[PDB]
Design a protein around this ligand. Structure first.
Ligand SMILES: [Cl-]
Length: 226
């Protein structure tokens, strides 16, 4: 099945990504607090709703939050400043707080139910966001031997997410706070940091056959743009 691409709002970042965030893939964006990772998540939750000539997939989004970073009014702002109805856009973002890592796993199973329900409608789910994906795993699996167990549980969670992406042709977008020898299993990893002039800088990590470069973007009333 053809890979779909969701624009980030930034032409620079989209170029680095080969046109946008891919369906049938997990894209991980990681960095310090304020690096742009959560602003990008909010922006994508709007962009996915647009038609493809505007960089979207005519879809809806599901946003799983682990550290209370979801801001409904930020979504409404991004929508309004892109010519969209804020309330309709917010209603197309299904939100859930994950209370712990086991609940986070159940929420992914519930996401599958919603994806199946909407799959053949005019607005399928096309984006699943997990913000600060590792935060509960890091607090719960800690101490001697926790590295192996945590990594096994994370790998299983990521395998479940990969299955949804591949089976239902959706993009999975995950964020993490930055922590250098641990394994990772996202399809594509993107490091974000602050740069000069209020800009954020993006770099692909461990993607040897994707072209060499860095993207530059801003955080604005439209979410993310150049
Ligand atoms: Cl951010």
């Amino acid at each position: 099945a053809t890979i779909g691409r969701i624009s980030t709002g930034s032409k620079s970042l989209d170029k680095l990504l080969g046109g946008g965030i891919e369906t049938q893939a997990i894209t991980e964006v990681f960095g310090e607090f304020g690096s742009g990772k959560t602003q990008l998540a909010h922006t994508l939750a709007v962009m996915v709703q647009l038609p493809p000539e505007e960089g979207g997939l005519n879809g809806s989004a599901m946003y799983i939050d682990t550290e209370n970073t979801f801001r409904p009014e930020r979504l409404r702002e991004i929508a309004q400043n892109r010519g969209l109805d804020p309330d309709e856009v917010l209603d197309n973002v299904a939100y859930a707080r994950a209370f712990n890592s086991n609940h986070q796993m159940l929420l992914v199973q519930q996401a599958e139910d919603m994806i199946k329900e909407l799959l053949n409608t005019d607005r399928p789910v096309k984006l699943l966001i997990v913000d600060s994906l590792t935060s509960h795993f890091r607090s719960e699996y800690i101490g001697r031997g926790a590295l192996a167990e945590r990594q096994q549980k994370l790998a299983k969670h990521l395998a479940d997410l990969h299955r949804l992406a591949n089976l239902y042709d959706i993009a999975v977008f995950v964020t993490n706070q930055v922590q250098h020898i641990l394994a990772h299993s996202a399809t594509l990893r993107v490091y974000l940091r602050k740069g000069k002039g209020g800009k954020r800088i993006a770099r692909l990590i461990d993607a040897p056959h994707l072209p060499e470069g860095e993207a530059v973007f801003s955080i604005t009333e439209k979410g993310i743009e150049d």
